[PDB]
Design a protein around this nucleic acid. Structure first.
Lengths: 192, 148, 125, 124, 340, 305
RNA sequence: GUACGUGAAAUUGCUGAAAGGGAAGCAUUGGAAAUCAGUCUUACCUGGGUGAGAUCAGUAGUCUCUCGAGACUAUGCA
RNA sequence: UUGAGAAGCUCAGACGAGUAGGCAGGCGUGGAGGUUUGUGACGAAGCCUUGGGCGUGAGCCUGGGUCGAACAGCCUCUAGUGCAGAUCUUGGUGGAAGUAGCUAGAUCUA
RNA sequence: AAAACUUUCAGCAACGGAUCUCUUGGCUCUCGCAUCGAUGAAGAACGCAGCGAAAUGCGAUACGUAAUGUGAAUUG
């Protein structure tokens, strides 16, 4: 069984395998380490224990060889206490006389899943900027319409049109301080 | 359309464009190089002089087969010609740019040829070389006293 | 899945049949759904479109518009609906073609031929 | 643990800079009378197994992490136990709708992302 | 239709809008604006509770007045000036009418009940910060009050009385005891306490000890719509996260016997309680809605877009208009069309 | 698209294009001949055949203000959040310019150029985990009137949110085409004089709020001697920010004959309004006064500012 | 924009920067200039106070598996 | 002590030119079966780039720009599968050159 | 030595039509069938389309008539 299963899945084809350059990973949800190994394969290991998180609560999942052909009842689940010391002892009691490597890998996953929940709670409290996507179509539309808007704006024509307009209305004092004498003389004769 | 130069915004530029013009590309490249950067009013006189052979267009890059002339001393060289067909096209384009500036309401006493570029149109053993010509005319940018 | 060896699943032959279809076939290719009221009153789900039919545009920019079908353009598989136009450069209104499956028939230009069609396709009136 | 690279310059194909028709990708010189093949003085170097880098630090980025290509949130969750060895790298074809959810998920997992600020802006 | 509106500058506008009117469309018939009232920001309008055909208008300075809209122009039928000794730091957060008593709840928790005909005022102290209070329509002497960090609690004057209570002996401070108080929901998945900030309350028993099991719904500042039941328990019966932005108002739709809620992101939608989901959304409303009133099929939405939007119970835009001034309240006077 | 042959339909198009050019030329030459003989047909054609432009064919909206003064509009502006600037109090604007967390050198260059445009405006580097609402409440007690926050990421400034202390409306913009003074051809060196402000084309009611908010950042007593002008121009919902150094002179274009010679000072950028919030800026829990929808901005003839 | 999807290379024009006693030319090592990656303190431990609530109750129910294992509900928060 | 992809892990020493030729393991391309509860109009493929990274290398990943409708990793199957040369084939394009010269005007100019 | 000129790099504009994507086409295999003509065939020519770029259709009844069927089009 187990050694036949491993040869079929570990070396011919598994739909859960991600082939990386330095290591192979496992897409299985029931893998403690997340790697493709002989010891961490949930399919090839008839007795297997893992820790996974459900809506903020970490559970110990265990399966035995005697439930291998009943997929609905294959994995059993217990609640791990929020107290870390009690959670470690819960894994020790439920995994009693299991190999020390399997208890070791379950306690390692409990630490990483506890840190991730801790980091998830601290991220909620903090105020972080929301990432808003960049839309390639709207950027192209606004860049083109902006170019048309800038050309149609005629900024220099409109700036000098208003600046001369407020010179006529005398928004300054008696005579403005920004105008040369000859220009001011031309303004007075023209406007009157 | 869009020209080769980052100017030709509405600000102060008037554009004139000629595509697939039936003139030699190498001759037009020399005429454009001469009148580039020169005032619009002066350019009309220079093109008028060339038509009457009073002035010569110096051929710098495509100088092969261009004889020595005494009218090129203004530009520092002695290889010059008197192209007419190429000058005629540039006269038509400059008038178009001048008319475009006048319609825009631009100040016509400060217009200079800010950018003029000649590109090779598709070739059509007698495949000649038509020309794409684009001209931008803008006012000479000036400074103003800061505060004193 | 199709099991008849008399019908082709070839995309090459399906596309050639649709785009090379004659006028008497494009009459059936240009069919439209009926409104819920007509559908449960005439006992018919869909009918080929026709001039004078009153339709409501269901999809596209003109979604929600209503009007009679002035003419059906079978060459391009388009409907031309009254008052559903687009302004041109010179201000002349160019009608916009709508696919027949993008409209719904809210009122039928009933004729004896179509009345016979209703009783033929399990309908009633 | 420091990453040592035996070489940083790439191995260019011989005479690849004289012709556009000859690409930069390395090709072994088959010419017998070629000075590059016989490895004279002044001739360019060739890919040898001696240039191979340390096995422990192979595939490692300058920050000490190994790149892991990620296409969705499920990929980034695999690095729960390997966040000190691997960095998430979102694929180039992953849309901005998923890039944001990968980056937020990778934040709680304590996983570095090599291109976390791509195709998005910020709003504090 | 026919609706009345008030603005931040305290002016009252009697809009004569009719079906199909859209001021954005240049071909529409402009509504017949009939404006009156003040033109001062110091006494801008806050609430517009509809007393049958009369209309009660509350202002920022406490000048509560009653208008009669059965005839045009409406006339100030009565006036009342709230003591300024209660408004130095507080403000009116709700103002409702039940059995000849006008309620003037403030932010500090002070409750002011005024009898209409007898002009009798009786104070009532309540709990801490108040953001929403509501009176039971069918049952006299019931208050549902809530606020920031203050869960909803039900105050009852008559314990049962088995049919009703006479208006004169109502709202005594020695007869009101809280017969129900809210219990907060469990901590979130991250072991974070779910914060409590009540923003609106509505009694939903019309759409779902005599007259027990007070079925009501509350909306919170954290975009949560909670349905309560005093009989099931002190915890919400069901909780929905209907928006990310704080919810603004909540109420019932008599036409379809459903519920509507609005948030500060300019989103008003109908929540189907039977299906436990949001069905539809009032499209076309821009800017956060300042107030919403429903009268039969019609529902009037006004907000920060300086517009009045008219919809039916099926979210179809019956009418729309622009009112220049920034509005703070809206009231439907007549659902039927003007020509009728 | 009837013709399936590319060469044939290219020959058919050219023969139809030539015919279209020819017959339009004949009717244009005939019209010119018959309208130069009778100037009447020329002067009514020009007055009738005015070219159409996006501004002329802009969609109709009633939110636009009118030339005539209306009491209701002026009564609303006399007690709003910006009233302390336009009233007889004449409270000088004290600006606080800050950036997003962990800004780069390039954001400082834009900020330094932006501080030149605003005398009496100081910069504070954004430190740690202080939020915009906290900055606003802290800046209000320090005597500040308007808070400007520059958002930058990937070494590029792309947004600008300005809030009006203490509870005034908060406007969120998106900056584009940022261009410091060094990148502008024939630029100038800004002096310490207070620049004048000119604001154009803010016709809609929402334009008044944004124009008043932008006006409220400038000291209302400009130094005439320095003759520096800062321009905010809203064209097609695009707000163009520019600063020049003018000088009146003689030009042959205007009927009066006087024109100014603008020399750009910088910075040069464009702002697109994305959101207006009533009250201090809180992106999650703010009252939306206005929120731009990209779907209905695809109508090139419809504008909100 | 019918010289019409995308629009590579060879090739050409203009503009900018740099270099330039009869070749370029590539390699190795640095300088200079330009330009990038490239990162940060923020968390842990230990309190105390305050309230909060379950996997805590000298607690009561329901559901799914099989006593007790998960999911919830009501109440208390000692 | 958790280090059993036993096809793994681990310890030690020696050694390293290479034509013909022998052998092994890998990179890439079109299509096929399976798989990734795969990627994509919130932008697939392609192309551009003095952006960054990985590999001894073949090559691969990625940012930015452009773009507009499809596409990829893994196991296996398959083949019209990888170019600098063939006075290679087709297409495009250069220097030679505005030259050799051949239509006008006055050897010169057009 | 700066200009010009030359070279290199980059930006923009040309030139060209690679790449990508598809496709009413080809190619291959299998299956069913048996039907030209002196009662004028195959082919060729010349005519008819209101215009049709050709191409298609048709034969002085000329892009067809009769009959049947569908039932409202035709379309540049």
């Amino acid at each position: 069984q187990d050694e036949v299963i491993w040869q079929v899945v570990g070396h011919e084809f598994c739909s859960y395998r991600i082939k990386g350059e330095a290591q192979n990973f496992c897409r299985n949800e029931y893998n403690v380490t997340g790697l493709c190994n002989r010891q961490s394969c949930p399919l090839a290991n008839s007795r297997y224990a893992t820790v996974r998180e459900d809506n903020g609560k970490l559970y110990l999942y265990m399966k035995t060889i005697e439930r291998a052909h009943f997929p609905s009842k294959l994995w059993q689940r217990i609640k791990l206490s929020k107290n870390y010391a009690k959670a470690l002892e819960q894994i020790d009691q439920q995994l009693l006389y299991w190999p020390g490597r399997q208890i070791h890998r379950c306690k390692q996953r409990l630490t990483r899943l506890t840190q991730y929940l801790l980091k998830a709670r601290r991220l909620a409290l903090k105020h972080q900027p929301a990432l808003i996507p960049i839309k390639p179509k709207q950027a192209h539309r606004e860049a083109s319409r902006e170019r048309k808007a800038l050309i149609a704006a005629k900024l220099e024509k409109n700036i000098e049109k208003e600046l001369v307009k407020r010179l006529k209305s005398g928004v300054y004092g008696d005579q403005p301080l920004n105008v040369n004498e000859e220009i001011w003389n031309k303004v007075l004769a023209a406007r009157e | 359309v869009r020209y080769s130069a980052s100017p030709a915004l509405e600000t102060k530029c008037a554009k004139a464009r000629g595509a697939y013009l039936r003139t030699h590309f190498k001759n037009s490249r020399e005429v454009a190089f001469t009148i580039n950067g020169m005032s619009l009013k002066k350019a009309f006189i220079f093109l008028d002089n060339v038509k009457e052979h009073k002035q010569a267009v110096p051929f710098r890059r495509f100088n092969g087969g261009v004889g020595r002339t005494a009218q090129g001393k203004e530009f520092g060289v002695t290889q010059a010609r008197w192209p007419v067909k190429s000058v005629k096209f540039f006269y038509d384009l400059l008038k178009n740019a001048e008319a475009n500036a006048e319609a825009k309401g631009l100040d016509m006493d400060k217009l200079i040829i800010k950018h003029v570029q000649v590109n090779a149109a598709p070739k059509q053993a007698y495949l000649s070389s038509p020309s794409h010509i684009e001209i931008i005319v803008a006012e000479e940018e000036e400074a103003v006293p800061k505060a004193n | 899945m199709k099991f008849s060896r008399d019908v082709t699943s070839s995309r090459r032959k399906q596309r050639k049949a649709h785009f090379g279809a004659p006028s008497s076939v494009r009459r059936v290719l240009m069919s439209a759904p009926l409104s819920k009221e007509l559908r449960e009153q005439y006992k018919i789900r869909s009918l080929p479109v026709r001039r004078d039919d009153q339709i409501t545009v269901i999809r596209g920019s003109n979604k929600g518009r209503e009007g009679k079908i002035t003419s059906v353009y079978r060459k391009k598989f388009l409907l031309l609906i009254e008052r559903v136009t687009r302004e041109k450069a010179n201000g002349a209104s160019a009608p916009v073609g709508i696919d027949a499956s993008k409209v719904v028939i809210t009122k039928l230009h009933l004729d004896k031929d179509r009345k016979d069609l209703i009783v033929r396709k399990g309908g009633k009136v | 643990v420091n990453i040592i690279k035996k070489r940083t310059k790439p191995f260019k194909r011989h005479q690849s800079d004289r012709f556009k028709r000859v690409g930069e990708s390395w090709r072994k010189p088959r010419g017998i009378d070629s000075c590059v093949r016989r490895r004279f003085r002044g001739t360019i170097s060739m890919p040898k197994i001696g240039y191979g880098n340390n096995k422990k630090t192979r595939y490692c980025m300058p920050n000490g992490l190994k790149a892991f290509l990620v296409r969705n949130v499920s990929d980034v969750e695999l690095l729960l136990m390997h966040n000190k060895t691997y960095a998430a790298e979102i694929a180039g074809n992953v849309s901005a709708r998923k890039r944001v959810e990968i980056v937020e998920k990778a934040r709680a997992l304590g996983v570095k992302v090599t291109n976390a600020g791509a195709k998005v802006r910020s709003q504090e | 239709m026919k609706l009345l509106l008030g603005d931040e500058i305290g002016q009252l506008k009697f809009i004569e809008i009719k079906k199909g009117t859209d001021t954005s469309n240049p071909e529409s018939e402009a509504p017949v604006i009939q404006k009156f009232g003040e033109l001062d920001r110091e006494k801008g309008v806050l609430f517009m509770l509809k007393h049958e055909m009369n209309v009660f208008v509350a202002r920022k300075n406490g000048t509560i007045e009653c208008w009669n809209v059965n005839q045009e122009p409406p006339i100030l039928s009565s006036l009342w000036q709230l003591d300024s000794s209660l408004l130095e730091t507080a403000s009116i957060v709700s103002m409702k009418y039940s059995n000849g008593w006008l309620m003037l709840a403030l932010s500090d928790g002070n409750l002011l009940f005024r009898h209409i005909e007898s002009s009798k005022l009786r104070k009532l102290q309540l709990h801490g910060p108040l953001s929403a209070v509501e009176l039971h329509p069918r049952i006299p002497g019931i208050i549902a009050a809530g606020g920031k960090e203050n869960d909803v609690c039900l105050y009852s004057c008559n314990p049962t009385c088995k049919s009703n209570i006479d208006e004169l002996e109502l709202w005594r401070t020695e007869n009101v005891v809280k017969v129900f108080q809210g219990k907060n929901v469990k901590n979130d998945s991250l072991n974070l306490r779910v914060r409590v900030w009540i923003t609106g309350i509505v009694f939903t028993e019309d759409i779902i000890d005599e007259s027990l099991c007070f079925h009501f719904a509350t909306i919170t500042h954290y975009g949560q719509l909670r349905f309560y039941d005093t009989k099931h328990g002190r915890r919400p019966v069901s909780t929905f996260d209907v928006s990310t932005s704080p919810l603004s108002h909540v109420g019932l739709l008599p036409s379809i016997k459903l519920l509507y809620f609005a948030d500060k992101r300019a989103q008003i939608s109908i929540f189907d309680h039977s299906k436990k989901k949001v069905i539809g959304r009032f499209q076309g409303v821009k800017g956060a809605p300042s107030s919403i009133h429903c009268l039969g099929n019609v529902v009037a939405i006004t907000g920060l877009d300086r517009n009045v939007r008219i919809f039916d119970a099926d979210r179809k835009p019956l009418a729309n208009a622009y009112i220049k001034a920034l509005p703070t309240s809206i009231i439907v006077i007549n659902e039927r069309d003007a020509e009728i | 698209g009837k013709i399936k042959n590319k060469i044939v339909r290219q020959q058919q198009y050219m023969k139809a294009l030539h015919q279209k050019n020819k017959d339009k030329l004949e009717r244009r030459k005939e019209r010119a001949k018959e309208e130069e003989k009778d100037p009447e047909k020329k002067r009514l054609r020009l007055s009738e055949n005015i070219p159409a432009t996006i501004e002329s064919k802009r969609v109709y909206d009633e939110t636009i203000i009118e030339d005539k003064p209306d009491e209701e509009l002026q009564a609303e502006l006399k007690d709003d959040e910006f009233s302390a600037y336009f009233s007889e109090e004449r409270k000088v604007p004290k600006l606080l310019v800050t950036t997003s967390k962990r800004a780069s050198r390039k954001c400082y260059d834009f900020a330094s150029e932006l501080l030149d445009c605003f005398p009496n405006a100081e910069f504070r580097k954004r430190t740690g985990d202080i939020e915009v609402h906290e900055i606003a409440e802290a800046a209000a007690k320090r005597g500040y009137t308007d808070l400007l926050v520059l958002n930058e990421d990937r070494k590029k400034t792309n947004a600008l949110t300005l809030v009006h202390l203490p509870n005034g409306p908060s406007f969120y913009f998106t900056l584009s085409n940022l261009q410091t003074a060094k990148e502008i051809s024939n630029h100038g060196r800004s002096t310490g004089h207070i620049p004048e402000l000119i604001i154009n084309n803010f016709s809609t009611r929402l334009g008044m709020t944004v124009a008043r908010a932008f006006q409220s950042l400038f000291i209302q007593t400009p130094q005439i001697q320095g003759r520096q002008v800062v321009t905010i121009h809203c064209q097609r919902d695009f707000l163009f920010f520019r600063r020049h150094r003018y000088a009146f002179r003689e030009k042959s274009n205007m009927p009066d004959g006087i024109g100014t010679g603008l020399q750009e000072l910088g910075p040069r950028f464009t702002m697109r309004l994305r959101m207006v919030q009533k009250g201090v800026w809180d992106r999650k829990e703010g009252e939306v006064f206005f929120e731009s929808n990209a779907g209905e901005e695809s109508d090139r003839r419809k504008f909100w500012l």
